[PDB]
Write a protein that binds this ligand. Structure first.
Ligand code: BEF
Ligand code: BEF
Ligand SMILES: [Mg+2]
Ligand SMILES: [Mg+2]
Ligand SMILES: [Pt+2]
Ligand SMILES: [Pt+2]
Ligand SMILES: [Pt+2]
Ligand SMILES: [Pt+2]
Ligand SMILES: [Pt+2]
Ligand SMILES: [Pt+2]
Lengths: 121, 121
């Protein structure tokens, strides 16, 4: 179980990784889109948690690019963007789930397990 | 693409089925847990939309029962129960997604497509 976290908020990015590592997985944490590509190419993760607001390329663009290149791993978006329209666009672009901030780590964890649970049943 | 809708609010149940039928699928609509079992046994749906508050057995109980009997089809819960704790419990019980009412049909549709998209990629 390898997880990739893409989040530019350093504190949040670190907390997420620790939570996920404590849950029992190997985790890579990227602070922007390009660094996400680095880890993706180094080790294709089983699942990715993706933030939408990033310093350069935004999460939606990253997701579209990845899907267009046959990267099919489950992607759960965790973002401050709350509009239902963005949820629709992001999910339609290839995201598997979409959670808004502020969030409850317990729900994100349960949603990750739902994706992993089915991805490897 | 066969969908099963389990909802005791008749008007809502009918609207959902029409929406889903208009989207291009065959749809069965059940008004309670036991009737859901009827359709499930008649034709195993590719995906089920499940309401939690039902006249007799509640949605959570139905989901647990189905999962315990090897029924593994994707399940998206659509309910008035909003607490994050219920979301965690229901997802942990086997639900694949959880959407609260009131909702935007466009988001539910996008979430159903995400499940179907991966379930049959
Ligand atoms: F910047 Be992320 F979308 F919260
Ligand atoms: F009765 Be359902 F949970 F909206
Ligand atoms: Mg950000
Ligand atoms: Mg109900
Ligand atoms: Pt934190
Ligand atoms: Pt997690
Ligand atoms: Pt996991
Ligand atoms: Pt309606
Ligand atoms: Pt739908
Ligand atoms: Pt469909």
């Amino acid at each position: 179980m390898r997880v990739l976290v893409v989040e530019d908020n350093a504190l949040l990015r670190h907390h997420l990784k620790v939570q996920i590592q404590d849950a029992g997985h190997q985790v890579d944490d990227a602070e922007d889109a390009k660094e996400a590509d680095y880890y993706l190419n180094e080790h294709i993760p089983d699942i990715a948690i993706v933030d939408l607001g990033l310093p350069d390329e935004d999460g939606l663009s990253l997701i579209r690019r990845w899907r267009s290149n046959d990267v099919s791993l489950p992607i759960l978006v965790l973002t401050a963007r709350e509009s239902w329209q963005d949820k629709v666009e992001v999910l339609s672009a290839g995201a598997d789930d979409y959670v808004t901030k502020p969030f409850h780590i317990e729900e994100v964890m349960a949603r990750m397990q739902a994706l992993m649970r089915r991805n490897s049943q």
